[PDB]
Amino acid sequence: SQYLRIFQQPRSAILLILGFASGLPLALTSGTLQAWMTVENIDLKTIGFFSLVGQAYVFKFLWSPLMDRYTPPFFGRRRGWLLATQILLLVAIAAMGFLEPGTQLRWMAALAVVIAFCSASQDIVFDAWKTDVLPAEERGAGAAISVLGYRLGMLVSGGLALWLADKWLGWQGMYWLMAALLIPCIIATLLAPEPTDTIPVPKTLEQAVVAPLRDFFGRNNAWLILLLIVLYKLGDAFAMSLTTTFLIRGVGFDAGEVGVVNKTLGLLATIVGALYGGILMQRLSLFRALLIFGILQGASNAGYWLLSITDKHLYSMGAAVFFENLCGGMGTSAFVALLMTLCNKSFSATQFALLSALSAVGRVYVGPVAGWFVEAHGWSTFYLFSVAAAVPGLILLLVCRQTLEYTRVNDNFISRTAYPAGYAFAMWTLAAGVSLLAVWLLLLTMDALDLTHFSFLPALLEVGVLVALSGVVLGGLLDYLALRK
Ligand SMILES: CCCCCCCC/C=C/CCCCCCCC(=O)OC[C@H](COP(=O)(O)OCCN)OC(=O)CCCCCCC/C=C/CCCCCCCC
Ligand SMILES: CCCCCCCCCCCCO[C@@H]1O[C@H](CO)[C@@H](O[C@H]2O[C@H](CO)[C@@H](O)[C@H](O)[C@H]2O)[C@H](O)[C@H]1O
């Protein structure tokens, strides 16, 4: 009853519809396309242009500040951009089908790049719309319903699309149908609620760029929260990186069985776990849910440790995969809720995109290290290390209880006034490190244009990441000292 009420309310359907519209764009630019172009034997000539469509989704934060300042002529900051980024995908996705892959491959690639760029903006504005309107109690269930819509969109965009195209309809008509299925999405955008008009908006574009950073870094506890955001998901990334390879080699299973088992059980478990986490969060506070969910996520992948020693069996694999996926989808909703709470209403999506990118910066480094650890200590000890690698996230969450308990009851963050002498040094060092990484990115994009070549590529990135880590460590230590005193 009280746990059930959330589903009947009409805004839930709008959230799901707007979620499915994010998926239909993701697979009509990289995956169904190649399947279409396999008739024309996609070459290496167009990959130079085609390298950007995958890249728009990773680098969305840089063009994000433009979204908050600007507004469409009518409809307010967050319900006008969704009408503008859901009318452009429709004019391009259908048209793209008008082209012929015989002699217009470059035009097709350029249209794919434009479609990806539009989808990135729609995604960021939709995240801002989610964070602005949703109240304090229902955030987890909203995130779960959005994830369910996302998955139901990706599945329709790939599977049923391929089946229809190669059975009845044809490729051009499959593209036409994937274009025409966006009309309900724009209807839902038009009929959805809006953020209030009380909240102020930045007056200058440079102000839009600079204000969110000064607002987030002028908090009582900022560096500790940054460290928690970075280090929450390590214990899941480590196991998810090589679970498939372990199930292939260390146990003795076949590729098809592993693929099928993942492709069904992982989806079902993730969906059920996310919805359960949202329903339970609807009545439970943020900190207790975060702690319990983190402990469960850390203790989940001991099933893999049990599997590694014991001999092969189908049901053991099924149970372990089901449990791991349920615990992961269970904690992902709590993490999304924690990300959503911190940002303030006025500058929402810039502070959401930067935090989301900082969340995913963890997966880049763990990859090669996961490779080295296996040859060092066998398959089995790797998973014990995975179990023990979730301790820092729980410890940081335990230390940072005060701010999360105060925010729920006061709905605002206390400004920083303790130890004002040492924060400037850390901020300046972090700025210098980010500037160094920007210089490295400029060097990489200068080299990739074949205008010139540089021999200083990896060392600059290593130095910059070392400087950034040192700055964040100094900030965290100073914050801990201030909290103790
Ligand atoms: C409804 C609103 C929609 C808003 C967005 C619409 C965008 C439509 C079209 C945009 C085309 C943008 C072209 C930019 C060209 C200049 C930049 C460039 O060439 O960067 C290259 C460089 C490296 O590319 P490769 O060499 O292929 O990488 C190889 C890696 N191994 O690119 C990158 O590093 C990342 C990609 C670019 C990220 C975004 C750059 C900034 C934004 C550009 C366009 C968005 C609008 C900006 C202006 C807004 C105000 C008018
Ligand atoms: C200094 C700023 C922060 C660091 C910037 C450089 C590192 C960026 C993070 C590491 C690279 C991976 O970055 C991450 O890529 C995945 C790729 O699917 C993106 O994935 C995204 O997929 C779709 C895109 O519409 C979203 O619905 C989803 O929520 C999101 O995760 C993330 O938005 C991005 O953050």
Swiss-Prot record:
Membrane topology: Multi-pass membrane protein
Molecular function, one GO term: peptidoglycan transmembrane transporter activity
Side Periplasmic, residues: 31-45, 104, 239-262, 302-325, 452-455
PROSITE patterns: MFS
Keyword Hydrolase found: no
InterPro entries: AmpG_permease/AT-1, MFS, MFS_dom, MFS_trans_sf
Listed transmembrane segments: 10-30, 46-59, 80-103, 105-122, 220-238, 263-282, 286-301, 326-344, 420-451, 456-483
Stored Pfam families: MFS_1
Keyword set, alphabetical order: Cell inner membrane, Cell membrane, Cell wall biogenesis/degradation, Membrane, Symport, Transmembrane, Transmembrane helix, Transport
Side of membrane Cytoplasmic, spans: 1-9, 60-79, 123-219, 283-285, 345-419
Function of the protein: Permease involved in cell wall peptidoglycan recycling. Transports, from the periplasm into the cytoplasm, the disaccharide N-acetylglucosaminyl-beta-1,4-anhydro-N-acetylmuramic acid (GlcNAc-anhMurNAc) and GlcNAc-anhMurNAc-peptides. Transport is dependent on the proton motive force. AmpG is also involved in beta-lactamase induction.
Family: Belongs to the major facilitator superfamily.
Domain notes: Four hydrophobic segments are not embedded in the cytoplasmic membrane and form two large cytoplasmic loops.
Protein name: Anhydromuropeptide permease
Species per Swiss-Prot/TrEMBL record: Escherichia coli (strain K12)
